[PDB]
Amino acid sequence: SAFITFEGPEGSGKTTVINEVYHRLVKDYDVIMTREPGGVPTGEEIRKIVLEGNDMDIRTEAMLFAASRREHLVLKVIPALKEGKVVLCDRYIDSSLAYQGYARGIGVEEVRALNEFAINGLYPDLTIYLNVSAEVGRERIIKNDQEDLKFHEKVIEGYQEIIHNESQRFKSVNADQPLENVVEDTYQTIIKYLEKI
Amino acid sequence: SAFITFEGPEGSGKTTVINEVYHRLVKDYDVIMTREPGGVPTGEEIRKIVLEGNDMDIRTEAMLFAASRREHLVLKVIPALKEGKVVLCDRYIDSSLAYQGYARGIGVEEVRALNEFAINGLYPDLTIYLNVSAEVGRERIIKNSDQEDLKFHEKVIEGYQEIIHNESQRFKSVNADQPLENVVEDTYQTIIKYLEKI
Ligand SMILES: COc1c(CN2CCC[C@H](n3cc(C)c(=O)[nH]c3=O)C2)ccc(C(=O)O)c1Oc1cccc(Cl)c1
Numbered sequence A: 001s002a003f004i005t006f007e008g009p010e011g012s013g014k015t016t017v018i019n020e021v022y023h024r025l026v027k028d029y030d031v032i033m034t035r036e037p038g039g040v041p042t043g044e045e046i047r048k049i050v051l052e053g054n055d056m057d058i059r060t061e062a063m064l065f066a067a068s069r070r071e072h073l074v075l076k077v078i079p080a081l082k083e084g085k086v087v088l089c090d091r092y093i094d095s096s097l098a099y100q101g102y103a104r105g106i107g108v109e110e111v112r113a114l115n116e117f118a119i120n121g122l123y124p125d126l127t128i129y130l131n132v133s134a135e136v137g138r139e140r141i142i143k144n145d146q147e148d149l150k151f152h153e154k155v156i157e158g159y160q161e162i163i164h165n166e167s168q169r170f171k172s173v174n175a176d177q178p179l180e181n182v183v184e185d186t187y188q189t190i191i192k193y194l195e196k197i
Numbered sequence B: 001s002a003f004i005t006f007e008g009p010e011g012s013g014k015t016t017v018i019n020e021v022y023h024r025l026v027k028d029y030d031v032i033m034t035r036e037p038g039g040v041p042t043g044e045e046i047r048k049i050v051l052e053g054n055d056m057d058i059r060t061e062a063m064l065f066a067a068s069r070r071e072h073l074v075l076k077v078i079p080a081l082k083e084g085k086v087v088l089c090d091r092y093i094d095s096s097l098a099y100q101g102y103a104r105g106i107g108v109e110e111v112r113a114l115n116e117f118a119i120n121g122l123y124p125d126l127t128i129y130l131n132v133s134a135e136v137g138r139e140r141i142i143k144n145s146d147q148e149d150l151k152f153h154e155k156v157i158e159g160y161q162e163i164i165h166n167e168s169q170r171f172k173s174v175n176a177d178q179p180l181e182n183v184v185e186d187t188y189q190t191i192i193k194y195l196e197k198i
């Protein structure tokens, strides 16, 4: 089994990359694609609160992302890993660190303490970071707003801080390349990891 | 202003005590009494999720209590303290520490880290602990309204004892084994003594 998370800002080609990698990995592995809350009832109810809300306090929002994360982990990720599956998870702890911690200004270490309470030691076996420049990412967003551009840049700044501080489970993939190449580099990185157990 | 929380297991007479004490304090102070989620919409929605929880993971439950706590703090407690009010809050961080941390077995320090993220430095000025023995508490439970329940009740008390031993300075322990008229009087006097020193 393997718990593989995918991280990156919007415009990193993350959706395309996960779908294409899933289609190739399913040939050799029992694999699932998921994201939080991912159909878990309590997580879906939490997601409705976060969305069908207005000017929610950023720490309340962070705790709700963390609660949805735990429900998804316990009821969906862990049972799939127990079945021997390769779980491809679109966004996990690092999204809260970059978005809530860095971009929203709560502080990465404070948000880390919150998310370590939520995941209780269940860090990914491997994390693919789709390393897109702010400029390429901006173009992909318009293809697929001053405050939005700055928030997009802050998210990237946050991910850079996170990866600089920890580089073991993290594998950075050049997401400025055409998506065919991003898919190939991501697939090869995953296979290299999986074939080592 | 003053932020006063009330803590204790079930059977400590906490409901009766806070209501009576509040009724007395309003004569002399600008005071409000509240509890979580206390009508705050997001908090009420969180409460529904917790109550509808089928064998909910204890850490998810702890994060939901913490999220309800922050909504209630931000929308109700902090604005009242900014107006110079005395805020009487029925259950706060120490309920999560005793119930989620100690009794449920997550660990007090882990639940403290979670709740410190939620309250962001807003600890109570004073915490009234209604110190009832497990035996008196057990009897009040059977009067007001099994083995697993008795053990959980004892564990909650044990947790509160550990918490107060580690943070004696913030707590004022009131003998809750006394008849409730006396518990009300001792609680009221402890609060007045604190308030008249501000
Ligand atoms: C409000 O956050 C959402 C967004 C906004 N945004 C997109 C970029 C990622 C971002 N995000 C995502 C995660 C996982 C996290 O921990 N922190 C974040 O800030 C969330 C977009 C769609 C949905 C959406 O799902 O429609 C969404 O709601 C969610 C998504 C995941 C979990 C929860 Cl509780 C709510």
Ligand SMILES: COc1c(CN2CCC[C@H](n3cc(C)c(=O)[nH]c3=O)C2)ccc(C(=O)O)c1Oc1cccc(Cl)c1
Binding pocket: B036, B037, B043, B046, B047, B050, B051, B064, B065, B068, B091, B092, B095, B096, B099, B100
């Ligand atoms: C499931 O917890 C509840 C209980 C059970 N129990 C009673 C003893 C106190 C206990 N409790 C209370 C708080 C504040 C906390 O942080 N942790 C706890 O374990 C909660 C009783 C009534 C309600 C009730 O409100 O009907 C309730 O729901 C709540 C209470 C406060 C906050 C939230 Cl999110 C749900």
